[PDB]
Design an enzyme around this catalytic site. Structure first.
Site, PDB file in Angstrom:
ATOM      1  N   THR A   1       0.851  -1.227   0.000  1.00  0.00           N
ATOM      2  CA  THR A   1       0.000   0.000   0.000  1.00  0.00           C
ATOM      3  C   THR A   1       0.867   1.251   0.000  1.00  0.00           C
ATOM      4  O   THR A   1       1.888   1.315   0.680  1.00  0.00           O
ATOM      5  CB  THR A   1      -0.957   0.048   1.210  1.00  0.00           C
ATOM      6  OG1 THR A   1      -1.891  -1.042   1.135  1.00  0.00           O
ATOM      7  CG2 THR A   1      -1.724   1.382   1.251  1.00  0.00           C
ATOM      8  N   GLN A   2       0.436   2.242  -0.773  1.00  0.00           N
ATOM      9  CA  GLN A   2       1.208   3.451  -1.017  1.00  0.00           C
ATOM     10  C   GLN A   2       0.234   4.583  -1.291  1.00  0.00           C
ATOM     11  O   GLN A   2      -0.984   4.407  -1.217  1.00  0.00           O
ATOM     12  CB  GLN A   2       2.132   3.257  -2.236  1.00  0.00           C
ATOM     13  CG  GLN A   2       2.147   1.813  -2.727  1.00  0.00           C
ATOM     14  CD  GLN A   2       2.112   1.595  -4.227  1.00  0.00           C
ATOM     15  OE1 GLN A   2       1.558   0.591  -4.657  1.00  0.00           O
ATOM     16  NE2 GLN A   2       2.675   2.501  -5.022  1.00  0.00           N
ATOM     17  N   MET A 107      -1.536  -6.547  -2.465  1.00  0.00           N
ATOM     18  CA  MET A 107      -1.747  -5.299  -1.730  1.00  0.00           C
ATOM     19  C   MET A 107      -0.591  -4.318  -1.936  1.00  0.00           C
ATOM     20  O   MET A 107      -0.214  -3.577  -1.029  1.00  0.00           O
ATOM     21  CB  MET A 107      -1.988  -5.578  -0.238  1.00  0.00           C
ATOM     22  CG  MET A 107      -3.239  -6.400   0.030  1.00  0.00           C
ATOM     23  SD  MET A 107      -4.747  -5.534  -0.441  1.00  0.00           S
ATOM     24  CE  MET A 107      -4.872  -4.338   0.888  1.00  0.00           C
TER      25      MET A 107
END
Ligand SMILES: [Mg+2]
Lengths: 232, 222, 240, 235, 231, 212, 244, 250
Positions: A1-2, A107
């Site tokens: 996730t970013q 993810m």
């Protein structure tokens, strides 16, 4: 996730009788800062495919390298690399679509919305979309981000369904695309005046137009507008 | 924060006849209030006289259908081109779905075809693999609008024979393929009126002993 | 890891490492098993080459795997401990998961399976051990007696012997054991087991061990004097 | 020494060829396939009279519709049977159906060549896998340690195999009844066995569509042995 | 001699004996023929039985809708290699929406077989394969050797007595390459080719195995009464 | 959902409803809450539909492997424990299960084990699980006897589900009845609650609060 | 490849013997003799150091007798380095048991554990066995005073009196002759030294060539004391018993 | 690749001999003589700097090595094997002791660790034994001064004085006649130089002899002042000049 950092806005596209058109502005935004003004977001693959990318630019540059590596790899032990066994738009898309869905399933997505525009071996038009979620769909017109909200309605007036495609010439399609880019410049706060446009035609091949500008703009009517209600 | 799921809308409907089965679905694909495509096929011929649709999050739906088609291919390789029966396909799909029990395919899956006695069959799945053979099943956005209608018009629920006043139920007479398609078309026409995510087009796949046939019908594009 | 295939086929279709493991069993002290009508008796030879031994603490030849099953053996002593430990662990694991103690056949099948595994696994040699596994299934009064060997084959026996000079005591058992009428009492079964060992043992002093297993986890090892009384009575009948 | 996966100059795997020699030393097992069912029969061959012969388990159930007989180093068969049973049950779990007899046999044969320097050596046992499925009916397969399996109308393995196979060559026809097959297995077992055949040193079994796989009682087999003796004395 | 104990050892003349012994297993195997025109590609295989009660060992394996092979030698090795081809064909379709080129399929088989010839502990594959397929560049026929050598050919044969069929195809080269749009005549040529490798035995209904792939023809295998037409 | 199972003289009665809901939305009225593990073993479905279906089908595979290997029918004790030990491995991952593993063997007699996704395994005579369990328990507790006839026992289980179906919003549709004997379970039909309610009201004189 | 150079340490001979175990036992037969004698009121451990030098620092030297814990000691015969590997493992096992159960490890359980480690090297791993034989002298409240021996095969046995190393045949015969069950520690001390004095390959038995230890309940009241004898204390007991 | 030698290369022969250890001891026998002598107030270890070439700078080759501030080591046999053992010995003194107890290990325990490493090369898969015998001299608070020999087998013994390598048999006899329990450190150094002269053929001076002592604490070699309890290393390598000074009183 970013989170996306340096971003590119709308990519718009449509089919016409003999091929496809795709376009995207040359801006790399850093939030509200219009940081980078010479970013090419249309990336040709061979002479039959153009991949338009919006969203995170660092991920775009990664995808750009994957496509470059794909061309190298396809040429390995392939005597027909520039003929029958050349890369098709459908091959390039399915590859990207696989990667995008895999990355979202770990993810760790590539924070992009991608449109693959091209012409197949048999002359068929190819136009399909894929994004950071791995969601894919095809339509006579396709657009990402703001283009989806503002360009599609305009482009759908030209090609509203499949049967409108043979009736639509390249001049009419390009005109519609260029107008849509002007509308996006008026109304999208993360857009620029400068853009690139690519045409992939089954007869005339790939025509890549750089350093295009939004022109014929209407602003004169602004002089008459005063205040916000009662001011004269 | 990254949300790996999305909602592409859509509505699907499977009805099992006496010697046939239909699996219908609208062709509209959406996100939020935008239309992605007015024609993006959602119901697929998977081979062996089986039709399938995985409705909800389209990326998961495409992945599942793709994996099931692949399972059909390998079933032939591994078991001497044996035909995959609809019950065997259903159990196989359970394992595909439950394999991702803790990171599910965000879809409502329905398959349709014929059982080993040649009778119509529909199977309905939840996102994590629980499944059941059913006569009638709507899935997706407008499922709540369609199912009550089907209870009434297919199973004749709450309908009694005039004169008896509730004492004798309306008998459950078998429906033809033509009669079923009428109910499917009216179900989607009504759903199109009252659900914003439903419209554009209706694609129906009909399954008989002769094979898989397709029918397409326009829906309102607003 | 060490992966070398030690157990392999030879041109004549023999696995010599498994066959040489049997030769280790042939060298081991004699063990015998005899099942009566309502009991099983395990007899074991103790070689009297070792005196000054502390018999209290020296590893006994018969081992309880559970309260209802026992295991004796012939062959390498150190090897047998590994099989006994595994069998004991499996016995408790079975009680834990099935909520019922192992049957004698199940326990035998497990031990035999371990032995077989060591005949086609890389980097290991076969167990130089044959076992006699005896006892009673839970809530059952039918006597059980099984044998295993290095190859991993196992089977049930009315009476059986393993180890050195087992050919001789098997000869004795084959003519003295009647299937239609097995040793009806504990006395008769123990007597026949002691008699069979006396064909081979030497002195009937501290050279013979006897363990009696009865139904419902009733297992007891006979003492020197108790066995000595059998030894005395056998030879006094023989003087005739 | 030399590799376990080594080829001979003739193009054969030494270890596989040597395991075949071990199977030749094994007790005889015979299978006969008919349109009414498949019969499986074995020689028990107890090494001593004190050995309780009913504990000799050389015929084994894999599933309700698949049985199996073994010959050679029978201890090696246990993990093969375990795998077969697991494969049969697992396929039912995945597909809500019976597994094809061929597919089961293929799954067992996949284990065969998984040896090297995986297990340290090939299996020293051959299997006769008999069963029924809806697609190909009654079937009999011969699974070898080479990984090869042949389908057979009738097949004998073990020490008396070539004599038995020659006998099966003459006796088998496509119209055999189940009863005729039972007597035929008994007849040929009796011919190749060292000891005199009875219900305690030989075992019969069959697989039918209706009743599935069944190992025959010693009382049931004893009657078939008596029926055999009388019909041979009948001419 | 002293240099044939494993695949990791060259002989003094630079030979790999274990690979050569694996090659020998193919020569013991039953004959199979491969040939093609510009529209179709055909496999013909003489199946071998154990005895009169036994079935005839299958020789042809389907890898995809557009590709498959015939085997000669160790059948389990063919199952391993054909399974690998099925996976590679499948990877190409799933990831790239692309049918795997027959030439690329040959390259993959070559590389897989090579790794088993240069490392300790392993062994070479003991089977030869004839791969036919129809892709974007038309019909193709490949010959695979477990040495790793893969060769594209108009026609060929492998197995026992394969030299007879190979000479026939070498004579008929100019004729059978021109058999376009006529599957039956191309199979006839293949059946006539494999007949040059028969001795004592002849082609019966459960003996013969034929496979074909072409322009508008998925890879299909013909056995039993389906090949009686060609006997 | 409402499921019950109780031991009695004639074996075990298993009774369940048929409703499945997704919030207020009634997804199905025709769900099978009794999982036929094998011809001798039954399992009830409560909590996670998939979790119960999947693992109790899997349980049947394990029970089948057991009787192949041991040449003997698996005990209800052993069958229940295979399932409880399995779900205990997954504890914390989010499985949702509340089931009664029901069987009748020689050594045990009629036996019921309540097995649950947090690892609980309870042997008992009467169990009731689901959103309508309290309603069913009331009818069960006041009418249960060991010396019930098979006919009266079947009715009691049916009537107890009806009690739940009426009062519990998330229970209803139809009643499925099973009777477990030593020789296997016997199915005793699907009973629409709509029709059953009025029938029971009239014949029994119960539900005087409801107008019919 | 590598197979060529593999000695295959874990294989049977045609006679069913473990080559390496047998050869390790041959090695041990050349090691200095160690003797253990169990009495009613304690245990004696006596052992001969191998042909020493006058420049060897004896008072800080240890090659034969090792402490495993406060209740259990061992006498070593064979490769000293191999023994120390096993000894440290045994010391850890004793402490693991004490931590787990809060009770001192029973002697046999420690002996079985070490013996199982030795066994493993004869069945798997392709490594050479430990060329060591132990005499275990220990006390616990179950069996009281106990003597065990273990050898490279991993087989162990219990003893009233036992020898390992060189001249065990001669030593065992002498012990078997003079040992009695009602014997006491002071008598056992004398027997052990007399046996070594007769079986030794040296010209005479002196203090500098010996290691000595006793395990006594001669610890004030209801407890056990280990006494590793000092060079001067070995010299005194040699005079007391009338050997020097 | 992968190390596929997972089996022992040292095994028992029929006679009970461990061949590779015996052969390692033979390599030690061919090695240059080194010796050690323990005094009442110190220990001395010495060896010859057998220079392979006169162009070689033999000062850059250290046969006598500091293991800890109070422990030193010398060897006979294969030099490269010694060098890596010194690296391992230095590290194990920290990892298995100093990082746990906050102090350097006593001589006997460091010796024990080195011995363990050498034992493992005698049993572990795919390795040969170390071809060296070590002499390790050291001091610690509770044991005082000590001298240990460690052999290829992993066996170690404490000595009052000893020699290893080429002329060890003759050197040990020489040490037996001279050694007593009342020697001062200077007397032990004198005896060391006398003993070592017998086994040396060519030049005998401070440049061809390597000699170190374990003696008094050297606060001048500590590198810092201010902590009373820290008084400096007891290991000190004698200079070329310091050796030559004692060769005049020889
Ligand atoms: Mg609408």
């Amino acid at each position: 996730t970013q989170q996306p950092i340096v971003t590119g806005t709308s990519v718009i596209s449509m089919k016409y009788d003999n091929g496809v058109i795709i376009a995207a502005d040359n801006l790399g935004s850093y939030g509200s800062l219009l940081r980078f003004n010479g970013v090419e977001r249309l990336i040709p693959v061979g002479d039959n495919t153009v991949v338009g990318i919006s969203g995170d630019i660092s991920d775009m540059q990664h995808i750009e390298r994957l496509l470059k590596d794909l061309v190298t790899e396809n040429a390995y032990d392939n005597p027909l690399a520039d003929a029958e066994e050349a890369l098709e738009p459908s091959y390039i898309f399915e590859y990207l679509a696989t990667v995008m869905y895999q990355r979202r399933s770990k993810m760790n997505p590539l924070w992009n919305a991608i449109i693959v525009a091209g012409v197949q071996s048999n002359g068929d038009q190819f136009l399909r979309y894929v994004n950071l979620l791995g969601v894919t769909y095809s339509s006579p017109t396709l657009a990402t981000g703001f283009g989806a909200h503002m360009a599609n309605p305009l482009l759908r007036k030209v090609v509203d369904r499949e049967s409108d495609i043979p009736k639509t010439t390249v001049q009419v399609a390009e005109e519609a695309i260029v107008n849509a880019m002007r509308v996006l410049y008026y109304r999208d706060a993360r857009s620029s005046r400068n853009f690139s446009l690519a045409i992939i035609d089954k007869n005339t091949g790939l025509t890549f137009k750089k350093n295009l500008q939004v022109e014929n703009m209407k602003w004169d009517f602004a002089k008459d507008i005063k205040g916000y209600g009662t001011q004269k | 924060q990254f949300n790996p799921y999305g909602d592409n809308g859509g509505t699907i409907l499977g009805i099992a006849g006496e010697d046939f089965a239909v699996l219908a679905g609208d062709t509209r694909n959406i996100t939020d209030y935008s239309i992605n495509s007015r024609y993006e096929p959602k119901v697929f011929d998977c081979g062996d006289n089986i039709v399938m649709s995985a409705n909800g999050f389209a990326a998961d739906g495409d992945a599942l259908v793709k994996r099931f088609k692949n399972s059909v291919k390998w079933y032939h390789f591994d078991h001497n081109d044996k035909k995959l029966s609809i019950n065997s396909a259903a159990r196989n799909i359970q394992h595909l779905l439950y394999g991702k029990r803790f990171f599910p395919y965000y879809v409502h899956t329905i398959i349709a075809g014929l059982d080993e006695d040649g009778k119509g069959a529909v199977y309905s799945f939840d996102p994590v693999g629980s499944y059941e053979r059913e006569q009638c099943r709507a899935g997706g956005a407008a499922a709540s609008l369609i199912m009550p209608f089907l209870d009434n018009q297919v199973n004749f629920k709450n309908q009694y024979e005039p004169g008896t006043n509730g004492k004798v139920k309306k008998p459950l007479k078998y429906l033809s393929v033509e009669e079923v398609i009428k109910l499917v078309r009216d179900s989607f026409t009504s759903a199109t009126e009252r659900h914003i995510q439903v419209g554009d087009g209706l694609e129906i796949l009909i399954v008989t002993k002769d094979g898989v046939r397709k029918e397409f019908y326009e829906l309102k594009r607003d | 890891g060490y992966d070398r295939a030690l157990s392999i086929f030879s041109p004549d279709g023999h696995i010599f490492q498994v066959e040489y493991a049997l030769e280790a069993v042939k060298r081991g002290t004699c063990a015998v098993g005899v099942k009566g009508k309502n009991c099983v008796v395990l007899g074991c030879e103790r070689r009297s080459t070792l005196k000054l031994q502390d018999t209290r603490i020296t590893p006994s030849k018969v081992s309880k795997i559970d309260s209802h099953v026992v295991l004796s053996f012939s062959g390498l002593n150190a090897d047998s401990r590994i099989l006994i430990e595994k069998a004991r662990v499996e016995a408790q694991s079975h009680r834990l998961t099935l909520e019922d103690p192992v049957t004698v056949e199940y326990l035998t099948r497990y031990v035999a399976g371990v032995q077989q595994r060591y005949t086609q696994s890389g980097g290991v040699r076969p167990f130089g051990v044959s076992t006699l596994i005896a006892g009673f299934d839970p809530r059952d009064d039918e006597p059980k007696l099984y044998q295993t060997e290095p190859s991993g084959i196992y089977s049930s026996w009315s009476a059986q012997t393993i180890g050195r000079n087992s050919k001789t005591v098997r000869e004795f058992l084959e003519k003295n054991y009647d299937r239609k009428e097995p040793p009806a009492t504990v006395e008769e079964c123990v007597k026949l087991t002691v008699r069979s060992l006396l064909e081979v043992v030497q002195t009937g002093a501290k050279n013979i061990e006897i363990t009696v297993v009865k139904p419902d986890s009733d297992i007891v090892a006979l003492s020197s004097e108790e066995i000595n009384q059998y030894v005395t009575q056998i030879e006094q009948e023989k003087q005739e | 020494d030399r590799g376990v996966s080594t080829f001979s100059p003739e193009g054969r795997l030494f270890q596989v060829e040597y395991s075949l020699e071990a199977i030749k030393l094994g007790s005889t097992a015979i299978g006969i396939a008919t349109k009414e069912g498949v019969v499986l029969g074995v020689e028990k061959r107890a090494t001593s009279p004190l050995l309780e012969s009913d504990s000799i388990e050389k015929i084994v159930e894999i599933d309700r519709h698949i049985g199996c007989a073994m010959s050679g180093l029978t201890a090696d068969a246990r993990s093969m049977i375990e795998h077969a049973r697991t494969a049969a049950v697992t396929h039912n779990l995945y597909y809500d159906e019976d597994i094809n007899v061929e597919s089961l046999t293929q799954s067992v044969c996949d284990l065969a060549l998984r040896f090297g320097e995986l297990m340290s050596r090939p299996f020293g046992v051959a299997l006769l896998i008999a069963g029924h499925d809806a697609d190909d009916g009654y079937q009999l397969f011969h699974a070898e340690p080479s990984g090869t399996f042949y389908r057979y109308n009738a097949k004998a393995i073990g020490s008396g195999s070539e004599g038995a196979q020659a006998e099966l060559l003459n006796e088998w026809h496509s119209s055999l009844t189940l009863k005729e097959a039972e007597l035929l297995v008994l007849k040929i077992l009796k011919q190749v066995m060292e000891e005199k055949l009875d219900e305690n040193n030989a075992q019969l079994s069959c697989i039918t569509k209706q009743d599935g796989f069944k190992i025959y009682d010693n009382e049931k087999t004893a009657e078939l042995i008596k029926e055999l003796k009388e019909k041979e004395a009948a001419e | 001699n002293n240099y044939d104990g494993d695949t990791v050892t060259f002989s003094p003349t630079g030979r790999l004996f274990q690979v050569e012994y694996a090659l020998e297993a193919i020569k013991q195997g039953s004959v199979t023929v491969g040939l093609r025109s510009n529209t179709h590609a055909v496999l013909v295989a003489l199946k071998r039985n154990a005895d009169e009660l036994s079935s005839y060992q299958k020789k042809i394996i389907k890898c995809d809708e557009h590709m498959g092979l015939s085997l000669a030698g160790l059948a389990p090795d063919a199952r391993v290699l054909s399974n690998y081809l099925r996976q590679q064909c499948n990877y190409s379709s799933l990831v790239f929406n692309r049918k795997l080129a027959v030439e690329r399929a040959g390259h993959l088989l070559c590389d897989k077989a090579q790794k088993n010839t240069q490392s300790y502990g392993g062994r070479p594959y003991g089977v030869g394969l004839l791969i036919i397929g129809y892709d974007k560049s038309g019909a193709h026929l490949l010959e695979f050797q477990p040495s790793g050598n893969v060769t594209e050919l108009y026609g060929t044969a492998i197995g026992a007595r394969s030299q007879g069929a190979k000479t026939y195809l070498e004579r008929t080269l100019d004729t059978f390459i021109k058999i376009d749009g006529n599957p039956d005549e191309l199979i006839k040529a293949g059946v006539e080719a494999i007949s040059q490798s028969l001795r004592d035995e002849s082609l019966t209904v459960d003996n013969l195995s034929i496979a074909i792939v072409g322009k508008d023809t998925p890879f299909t295998i013909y056995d039993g009464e389906a090949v009686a037409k060609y006997i | 959902t409402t499921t019950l199972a109780f031991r009695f003289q004639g074996g075990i009665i298993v009774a369940v409803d048929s409703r499945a809901t997704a919030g207020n939305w009634v997804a199905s009225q025709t769900v099978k809450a009794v999982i036929e593990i094998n011809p001798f073993l039954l399992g009830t479905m409560a909590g996670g539909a998939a979790d119960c279906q999947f693992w109790e089908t899997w349980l049947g595979s394990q029970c089948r492997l057991h009787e192949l290997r041991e040449k003997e029918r698996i005990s209800v004790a052993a069958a229940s424990k295979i399932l409880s030990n399995l779900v205990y491995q997954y504890k914390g991952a989010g499985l949702s299960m509340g089931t009664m593993i029901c069987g009748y063997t020689r050594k045990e007699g009629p036996t019921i084990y309540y097995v649950d996704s947090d690892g609980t395994r309870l042997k008992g005579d009467i169990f009731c699980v689901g959103s309508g369990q309290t309603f069913a328990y009331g009818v069960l507790d006041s009418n249960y006897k060991w010396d019930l006839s098979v006919e009266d026992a079947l009715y009691l289980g049916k009537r107890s589900i009806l009690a739940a179906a009426h009062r519990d919003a998330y229970s209803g549709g139809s009643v499925n009845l099973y009777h477990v004997t030593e020789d296997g379970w016997i199915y005793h039909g699907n009973h629409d609650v709509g029709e059953l309610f009025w029938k029971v009201k009239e014949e029994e004189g119960s539900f005087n609060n409801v107008i019919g | 490849g590598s197979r060529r150079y593999d000695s295959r340490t874990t294989i049977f001979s045609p006679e069913g013997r473990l080559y390496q175990v047998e050869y390790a036992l041959e090695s041990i037969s050349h090691a200095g003799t160690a003797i253990g004698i169990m009495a009613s009121d304690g245990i004696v451990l006596a052992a001969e150091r191998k042909v020493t030098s006058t420049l060897l620092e004896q008072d800080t030297s240890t090659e034969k007798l090792y402490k495993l814990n406060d209740k259990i000691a061992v006498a070593v015969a064979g490769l000293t380095a191999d023994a120390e590997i096993l000894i440290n493992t045994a010391r850890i096992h004793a402490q693991n048991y004490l931590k787990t159960y809060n009770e001192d490890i029973p002697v046999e359980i420690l002996v079985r554990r070490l013996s199982d480690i030795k066994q493993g090297y004869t069945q798997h791993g392709g490594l050479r066995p430990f060329g060591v034989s132990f005499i275990y002298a220990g006390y616990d409240d179950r069996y009281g005073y106990q003597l065990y021996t273990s050898n490279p095969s991993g087989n162990y046995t219990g003893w009233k009196a036992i020898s390992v190393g060189a001249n065990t045949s001669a030593a065992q015969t002498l012990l078997q002759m003079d040992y009695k069950d009602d014997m006491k520690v002071d008598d056992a001390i004398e027997l052990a030294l007399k046996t070594l004095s007769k079986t030794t390959d040296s010209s005479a038995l002196t203090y500098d060539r010996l290691e000595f230890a006793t395990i006594r309940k001669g610890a004030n009241d209801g407890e056990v004391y280990q006494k590793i004898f000092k060079p001067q204390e070995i010299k005194d007991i040699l005079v007391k018993t009338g050997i020097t | 690749m992968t190390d596929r030698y997972s089996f022992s290369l040292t095994t028992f022969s029929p006679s009970g001999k461990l061949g590779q250890i015996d052969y390692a001891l033979t390599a030690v026998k061919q090695g240059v003589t080194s010796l050690g002598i323990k005094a009442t107030n110190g220990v001395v270890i010495a060896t010859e700097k057998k220079s392979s070439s006169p162009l070689a700078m033999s000062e850059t080759l250290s046969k006598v090595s500091l293991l800890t501030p109070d422990i030193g080591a010398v060897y006979s046999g294969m030099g490269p094997d010694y060098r890596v053992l010194v690296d391992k010995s230095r590290k194990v003194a920290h990892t298995s002791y100093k990082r746990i107890y906050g102090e350097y290990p006593p001589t006997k325990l460091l010796v024990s660790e080195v011995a363990k490493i050498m034992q493992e090369a005698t049993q572990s898969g795919g390795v040969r034994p170390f071809g060296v015998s070590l002499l390790i001299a050291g001091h610690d608070e509770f044991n005082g001064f000590s001298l240990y020999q460690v052999d290829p087998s992993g066996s170690y013994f404490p000595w009052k004085a000893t020699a290893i390598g080429k002329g060890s048999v003759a050197a040990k006899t020489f040490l037996e006649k001279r050694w007593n329990d009342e020697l001062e450190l200077e007397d032990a150094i004198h005896i060391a130089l006398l003993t070592l002269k017998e086994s040396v053929e060519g030049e005998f001076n401070g440049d061809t002899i390597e000699l170190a002592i374990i003696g008094d604490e050297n606060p001048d070699l500590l590198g810092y002042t201010g902590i009373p309890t820290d008084k400096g290393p007891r290991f000190r390598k004698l200079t070329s000049q310091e050796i030559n000074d004692r060769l005049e009183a020889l």
